[PDB]
């Protein structure tokens, strides 16, 4: 005495309504529905960075972050506004909890495309389960100040574990120049969202 | 009389069938399912680039434009293609709709996976619900010709609103090549997709 | 009735039948199933199983890891190349696919889900058109390093082809006696729709 429209369906054989849906965009992860490859993102708020220091130097800069998962890979990407003109290298680290992900260095939030915060363990952001990482390069960075370039130069970035935590360390190279600029790259994470 | 296969579930008390699903992945608006943190892209249709005026110069450029909403970040991606060698700076404007995000400068569109485009407006690209933004950078680019290196450069963005609506200004530095490049950065919207 | 339906399921009375309903822009159905209008699909190279590539006919290699990714229409191609041999030149590191399928005939990639788990998914969604042409090329600034050292600010080309059936990204680097060890990224589009 009732009907169906896809994509639910009935059987008749066994009197059960079902939802259908492709398996590779969504899934059941206890009982509900859930997507295969969701876009989570790890990342400090909106308007509130996180204030970061080159090591023991009385140098800081505020970063604006963000840690987009999409399949099991991650897009790292920070804004860096340095205050303080320098010449050398800047050390600049980021810790997070190696159980549960949760950045120790600064507020960090996982934040949907609905503009609010998300009840989820930010795990995604962590390379391994077993807490070992080889991860490191170099991306080329262009330091300006209030729209004026300043310098070409390049950023370093490590993938570590320390003390059962992971770190992601950044070490800008400068002449003369505060360190402002915004650098990206990609990671793979081993910590599937099921 | 009938069963429910999670993901539906049904409850006895109040003879109520239900979805259940994770709400970091996806939620209810309206009455109706959707995503949490869905991708939108607004893109320049394919094959159809969008002409650019270098500022005041009777200079111009096709350019192939993708500005991807993942979470609340936006991802622009443009690739330039100029016509005309220049040493000096070029200005590449492109103005939206400040309450829309409807491109001005040129067509654009909201793309699905599907290749069909979607009847979305496209304020998922909009910095700020209260017309104010601050965002400026520049990033590291290399100009070339038909496979051939040219140079290894920079090009800056800023992120402002004019008389209500929003702009995103290039400003690519050359020395003697033309103007042909790809270059990507990432900024946040406060819009909330909901 | 004798029951309820909560949001987003509905019930419409003038019929009897139970709907679901959803953002079109967001979701959809396919063969009478639910899916999405934009997923995200990935096709990369194992954890931990690089692809093998060869400098042309040179005695040099890399290892490269690759992930290519899908949304929309677009492709965020990445990848980490680890030259194994100091140069001076430039390289070519050339990887094809079935022009076709999709599948990696240079090395072993897989389409992989959020899960972590491998999908039973053609990836034809990395190929540029179903008519088997395309012209996407351009160069990124790269830096090249080793151990945690600098070494060279330099440039990588990348190039979208089709040669004898097959999809082809070609990258060439620029060294100037370091190793080969760089990360780029570019985006290019797909006019295969996913449906
Ligand atoms: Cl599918
Ligand atoms: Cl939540
Ligand atoms: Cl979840
Ligand atoms: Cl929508």
Redesign the interface.
């Known amino acids: 005495?009732?009907?169906?429209?896809?994509?639910?369906?009935?059987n008749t054989g066994?009197?059960?309504?079902?939802?259908?849906?492709?398996?590779?965009?969504?899934?059941?992860?206890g009982?509900?529905?859930?997507?295969?490859?969701?876009?989570?993102?790890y990342?400090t708020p909106?308007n509130t960075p996180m204030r970061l220091r080159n090591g023991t130097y009385n140098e800081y800069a505020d970063a604006?972050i963000?840690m987009?998962?999409?399949?099991?890979?991650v897009?790292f990407?920070i804004?860096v506004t340095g205050e303080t003109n320098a010449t050398g290298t800047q050390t600049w680290e980021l810790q997070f909890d190696g159980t549960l992900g949760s950045c120790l260095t600064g507020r960090m939030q996982?934040?949907?495309?609905?503009?609010?915060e998300?009840?989820?363990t930010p795990t995604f952001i962590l390379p391994t389960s077993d807490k070992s990482v080889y991860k490191?390069?170099?991306?080329?960075?262009?330091?300006?100040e209030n729209?004026e370039?300043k310098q070409?130069?390049?950023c370093?970035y490590?993938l570590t574990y320390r003390l059962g935590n992971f770190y992601i360390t950044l070490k800008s190279?400068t002449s003369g120049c505060k360190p402002?600029?915004?650098m990206?790259?990609?990671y793979?994470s081993?910590?599937?969202?099921?």
């Open positions: 005495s009732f009907f169906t429209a896809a994509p639910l369906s009935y066994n009197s059960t309504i079902s939802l259908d849906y492709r398996s590779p965009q969504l899934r059941v992860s009982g509900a529905l859930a997507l295969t490859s969701p876009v989570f993102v990342q909106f604006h963000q987009v998962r999409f399949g099991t890979t897009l990407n804004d996982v934040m949907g495309g609905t503009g609010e998300l009840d989820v490191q390069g170099f991306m080329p960075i262009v330091c300006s729209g370039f070409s130069t390049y370093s490590a190279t402002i600029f915004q990206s790259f990609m793979e081993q910590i599937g969202i099921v």
